[PDB]
Amino acid sequence: KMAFTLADRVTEEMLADKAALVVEVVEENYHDAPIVGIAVVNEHGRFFLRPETALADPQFVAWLGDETKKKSMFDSKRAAVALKWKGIELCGVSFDLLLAAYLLDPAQGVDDVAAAAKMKQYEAVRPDEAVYGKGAKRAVPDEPVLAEHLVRKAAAIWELERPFLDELRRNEQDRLLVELEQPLSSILAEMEFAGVKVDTKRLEQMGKELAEQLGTVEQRIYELAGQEFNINSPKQLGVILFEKLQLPVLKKTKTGYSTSADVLEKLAPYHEIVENILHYRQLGKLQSTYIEGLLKVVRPATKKVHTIFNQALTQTGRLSSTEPNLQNIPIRLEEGRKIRQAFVPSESDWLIFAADYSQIELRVLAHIAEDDNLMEAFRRDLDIHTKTAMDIFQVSEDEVTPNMRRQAKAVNFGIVYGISDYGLAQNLNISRKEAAEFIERYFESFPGVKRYMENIVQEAKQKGYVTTLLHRRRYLPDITSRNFNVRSFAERMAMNTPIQGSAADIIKKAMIDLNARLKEERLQAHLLLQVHDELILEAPKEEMERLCRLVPEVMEQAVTLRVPLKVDYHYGSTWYDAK
DNA sequence: GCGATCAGCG
DNA sequence: ACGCTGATCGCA
Ligand SMILES: [Ca+2]
C-alpha cells in the first residue's frame, strides 16, 4: 500500500544529498545490538536495504559518514551508537523527529514515529509495538512486513520535517533543536559508546564483604525482633514493628503501615531495631543495585559499562540514565561512596576529572526572579546552603557538617518550590508554627523570589505553559483545574520547571562548548558522564593542568546571567578520588 | 505491573 | 502538603 524498491544492492540515487533515513534497532538497549533493516526516502524514491549488503558497501558507508549528505531521522542517537558498534560513523543528521516532538511537548511521551506523526494528523505509519509485538511475543516480522514499516517510517519523517520545524520556529525553539539538542545527541552518542571502565575485582570483593555484614545485621534484627521473619516483607515488618512491638503508627500507605526511612528515623527513640532495619536496607541497596546490578551489565571483555542517556524523557529537559543508571551512584554515606572507587579511567596513566556547578538552581533563580538580595548573595559568592544550615541548626560556619549542609539544601529548594509548613516541620523535626515562621522569614529576605513564584503561576494560567531560558516548554493544563490538590501540584510545577529546566539548558550548552574547545586544543580528554549539573571526563594525566583551567572556564561562560556561574572541580585516579 | 522504597541531582 | 528521575523487590 506504499510503493518502494526492495533493493538488492546500493545505487547512486540512494545517495542523494538529502534523505530520510531509518537504521532500525529493535532491542531497547541498542548497545552492540543488531541492525535489522534500513530504509531511505529521498527525491528519487523509497528504498529498503538489507543491512548485510548496505553496511558492507563502501559507497553507502561513505554516504553515512559524509556530513554534507543531510539525513532526517527519528532517534538518531540509537542509530549512531548501533553503527559505532559496527565500526561505522554516522554524520550529517540535520533533523531528529524524536527531539523535535520532545521540544514541542514533552508530555506526549513520544517514543516512536507513529506517535510523533499523530501530533500533525499523519497516520500512514504503524506504531512500532503493533509491528514487533510485546514481551515474549516480540519478534522481527517477515521481511516484506518489516520493509514496509521502515519505509513508512522514513516517508513520515520526510513529510513531517517541515511542519515540525514551522511549529518549533513559532515557539522560538528552532535554534533549541538545531544548535543544542541535535549537537548534544551526537556528543551523548560518543559518551555512551566510550563507556566507563569498572574495576570488577574491587566490586566483587566489596560484594563478598557486604554479604557477610548483611548476615550479622540480619541476625541482630531477628534477635531484637525476638523471632525470625522476612525483613523485606511489609506484612511481616509492619506486623513486627506496629503489632508485636506496638510501635506508634506515624504514617500509612494505601496498602498498610509505612516503613519509610523518615518514619523509621522517628521511631529510633522507641526501639533499637529500627536503626538496624535502616542499616540492613542500606547494605542491601548497595548489594542489589550497585554491586550485583553493576556486575550484570559490565561487558566482560572490556570491563566497561555503557549507559544510555535518555534525551527525550524528562518533563524539565534533564537527561536520565538507564541500564545502568550512572546518575545515582552512591556518594553521601561513606560506605556507599566507596563504590565510586570501582569507576576507573579506561587507559593507563589517564585520570578522572569531575566539574560541578555550585548552587546552580539558586543562581538561576536569582537571575530569573531578579531578587536583589539573592543576586547580591551570589555576587559575593556566598554559600546559601551553608548559610541556611547555620541558621537552621544554630551553629557557626565552621560547625556546619556535610550532612547539615545536605539538609539545608532540601530546605532551600523546598521553600522556593512551595513546601508547606507541615512538610518543613516534618523534615526538620521542628514545630509547625516554627516552620511557618521560618518560611515567612525566608521570603522577607527574598521578596523577589516570592513575587516571582506568584507571577509565574499567573503566567502559566494565562499562557497555558511555562518556559526556560532557552525556550524549552512545558504545558500545564492542570493549573486551572478546580480540584485543589491537582491545581496545587501544577502550581509547584510552574514554580520549579523554568528553574530546573534552565539549569538543564545551561549544562547542555556547556557540553557542546566543551567538546568544541577540546577539539580545538587537540586534547585527548573526553566526556564520560553528565549528572545534571556535573560533567565527568577522563584524560591523560599530562592534560590535567590544562583541563583545570579549560573546563571551569567553558562551563562558567556557557551563558551570561545577572550573577556569576561558579564551578567546583577535582581530579584523581578513580571517580571516588575526583572529589 | 505497580507501589513503596531509596539511590542521586536540584 | 518542594521538584526531576531509575532499579529493586514483594505483592495488604
Ligand atoms: Ca552542584
DSSP state string for A220-235:
HHHHHHTS---TT-HH
The reply to whether A264 and A228 lie within a common domain is: yes
Assigned domain for A560 exists: yes
The reply to whether A211 and A186 lie within a common domain is: no
Q: Which residues contact A290 (CB under 8 A, 6 or more apart)?
A: A329, A330, A336, A339
- C-alpha cell read off for A334: 561513606
Q: Give the number of other Cβ atoms within 10 Å of residue A414's Cβ.
A: 16
> How many A from CA of A105 to the centre of ligand 1?
28
In angstroms, the CA A556 to CA A553 distance is: 5
Which residue has the closest alpha carbon to C5 C1'? A320
The reply to whether A516 and A567 lie within a common domain is: yes
Q: Pairing relation of β-strands A5-7 and A473-475?
A: unpaired
CATH number for the domain that contains residue A368: 1.10.150.20
Assigned domain for A329 exists: no
Q: Quick one: CA dihedral A357, A360, A363, A367, positive or negative? A: positive
Assigned domain for A520 exists: yes
Closest CA to A441 of A492, A493, A388, A399: A388
CATH number for the domain that contains residue A273: 1.20.1060.10
- C-alpha cell read off for A66: 559524509
**Does at least one atom of strand C sit less than 7 Å from the CB of A288?**
yes
Assigned domain for A577 exists: no
Domain end, chosen from A502, A527, A556, is at A502
Residue entry with cell 566507563 = A196
In angstroms, the CA A96 to CA A181 distance is: 9
- C-alpha cell read off for A126: 504503524
Q: How was this structure determined?
A: X-ray
Residue A409 assigned to a binding site: yes
C-alpha A67, offset from chain centre: 28
Which amino acid is present at A193? F
In angstroms, the CA A82 to CA A579 distance is: 33
DSSP state string for A291-343:
IIHHHHHSBTTTTEE--EEESS--SSS--EEESS-TT----SSHHHHGGGGGE
Q: Which residues contact A237 (CB under 8 A, 6 or more apart)?
A: A229, A230, A231, A259, A277
Which residue has the closest alpha carbon to B5 C1'? A260
Please give the C-alpha separations between residue A51 and each of A39, A69, A169, A265, in angstroms, as whole numbers: 10, 19, 36, 57
> How many A from CA of A469 to the centre of ligand 1?
19
Residue A473 assigned to a binding site: no
What phi-psi label fits residue A98: left (phi over 0), alpha (psi between -120 and 50 degrees) or beta?
alpha
> How many A from CA of A440 to the centre of ligand 1?
26
- C-alpha cell read off for A61: 558507508
C-alpha A283, offset from chain centre: 25
Helix axis angle, A143-170 to A97-104, nearest 10°: 40
CATH number for the domain that contains residue A173: 3.30.420.10
C-alpha A404, offset from chain centre: 26
**DSSP-derived secondary structure letter, A255:** S
In angstroms, the CA A115 to CA A112 distance is: 6
What is the rounded end-to-end Cα distance, in angstroms, of chain A? 59
Residue A359 assigned to a binding site: yes
The reply to whether A153 and A276 lie within a common domain is: no
Q: Which residues contact A338 (CB under 8 A, 6 or more apart)?
A: A206, A576
Which amino acid is present at A301? A
Question: Which nucleotide is nearest, taking the CA of residue A333 and each C1'?
Answer: B7
The reported resolution of this PDB entry, expressed in Å, is: 2.0
Which residue has the closest alpha carbon to C2 C1'? A414
Q: Give the number of other Cβ atoms within 10 Å of residue A397's Cβ.
A: 10
Closest CA to A575 of A203, A113, A92, A172: A203
Helices (H), A111-250: 113-118, 128-132, 143-170, 174-175, 182-194, 200-225, 234-238
In angstroms, the CA A409 to CA A388 distance is: 8
Element (H, E) at A24: strand A18-24
Please give the C-alpha separations between residue A410 and each of A21, A119, A261, A432, in angstroms, as whole numbers: 46, 38, 16, 17
Assigned domain for A322 exists: no
Q: Are A299 and A305 in contact (CB under 8 A)?
A: yes
In angstroms, the CA A221 to CA A272 distance is: 9
Which amino acid is present at A234? P
Q: Are A324 and A297 in contact (CB under 8 A)?
A: yes
The reply to whether A298 and A408 lie within a common domain is: no
Please give the C-alpha separations between residue A29 and each of A26, A81, A297, A365, A396, in angstroms, as whole numbers: 9, 10, 11, 36, 50
Cα angle A479, A482, A486 (rounded to 5 degrees) comes to 55
Which residue has the closest alpha carbon to B9 C1'? A532
Domain end, chosen from A171, A194, A217, is at A194
The reply to whether A480 and A493 lie within a common domain is: yes
In angstroms, the CA A130 to CA A275 distance is: 49
Closest CA to A193 of A43, A79, A45: A79
Q: Are A5 and A118 in contact (CB under 8 A)?
A: no
Q: Are A359 and A368 in contact (CB under 8 A)?
A: no
Q: Are A80 and A94 in contact (CB under 8 A)?
A: no
Assigned domain for A167 exists: yes
The reply to whether A491 and A509 lie within a common domain is: no
Domain end, chosen from A176, A194, A212, is at A194
Residue entry with cell 520532545 = A102
For residue A5, the cross-strand partners are: A47
Assigned domain for A314 exists: no
Question: Distance in angstroms, CA of A284 to C1' of C8?
Answer: 10
- C-alpha cell read off for A156: 513520515
Which residue has the closest alpha carbon to B7 C1'? A328
Q: Give the number of other Cβ atoms within 10 Å of residue A230's Cβ.
A: 10
Residue A126 assigned to a binding site: no
What is the three-state SS of A471-505?
Answer: CCEEECHHHHCCCHHHHHHHHHHHHHHHHHHHHHH
The reply to whether A43 and A106 lie within a common domain is: yes
**DSSP-derived secondary structure letter, A15:** G
**DSSP-derived secondary structure letter, A57:** -
The reply to whether A186 and A258 lie within a common domain is: no
Helices (H), A55-137: 58-65, 76-84, 97-104, 113-118, 128-132
Helix axis angle, A360-369 to A484-520, nearest 10°: 110
Q: Are A303 and A200 in contact (CB under 8 A)?
A: yes
From residues 552-571 of A, list those within 7 angstroms of strand C by Cβ: none
Assigned domain for A310 exists: no
Residue entry with cell 560547625 = A399
In angstroms, the CA A227 to CA A218 distance is: 11
- C-alpha cell read off for A333: 554515606
Q: Are A328 and A459 in contact (CB under 8 A)?
A: no
Residue A80 belongs to what domain range? 5-194
In angstroms, the CA A190 to CA A519 distance is: 13
Q: Quick one: CA dihedral A131, A3, A56, A310, positive or negative? A: negative
In angstroms, the CA A87 to CA A480 distance is: 52
Cα angle A529, A108, A147 (rounded to 5 degrees) comes to 85
The reply to whether A174 and A28 lie within a common domain is: yes
For chain A, give me the number of helices (H) and strands (E)? 24, 17
In angstroms, the CA A385 to CA A352 distance is: 27
Which amino acid is present at A157? I
In angstroms, the CA A61 to CA A75 distance is: 19
b/e code A183-200 from CB counts within 10 Å (16+ = b): bbbbbbbbbbbbbbbbee
Q: Sort A148 into a burial class: Cβ within 10 Å, 0-12 / 13-18 / 19+.
A: buried
CATH number for the domain that contains residue A537: 3.30.70.370
Residue A334 assigned to a binding site: no
Q: Give me the number of domains chain A comprises.
A: 4
Please give the C-alpha separations between residue A79 and each of A29, A191, A358, A441, in angstroms, as whole numbers: 11, 14, 35, 53
- C-alpha cell read off for A570: 577535582
In angstroms, the CA A224 to CA A240 distance is: 10
On strand C, nucleotides with any atom < 7 Å from a protein CB are: 1-12
Q: Are A331 and A531 in contact (CB under 8 A)?
A: no
**Does at least one atom of strand C sit less than 7 Å from the CB of A296?**
yes
Question: Distance in angstroms, CA of A118 to C1' of C1?
Answer: 37
The reply to whether A477 and A520 lie within a common domain is: no
R_g over Cα of chain A: 26
Q: Pairing relation of β-strands A534-540 and A350-357?
A: antiparallel
Q: Quick one: CA dihedral A219, A225, A226, A227, positive or negative? A: negative
On strand B, nucleotides with any atom < 7 Å from a protein CB are: 3-10
The reply to whether A158 and A238 lie within a common domain is: no
> How many A from CA of A412 to the centre of ligand 1?
14
Residue A420 assigned to a binding site: no
Q: Which residues contact A367 (CB under 8 A, 6 or more apart)?
A: A375, A561, A562, A563
Q: Are A247 and A317 in contact (CB under 8 A)?
A: no
**Does at least one atom of strand C sit less than 7 Å from the CB of A487?**
no
- C-alpha cell read off for A485: 490538590
Question: Which nucleotide is nearest, taking the CA of residue A327 and each C1'?
Answer: B8
Residue A1 assigned to a binding site: no
Please give the C-alpha separations between residue A324 and each of A86, A293, A377, A563, in angstroms, as whole numbers: 22, 8, 38, 36
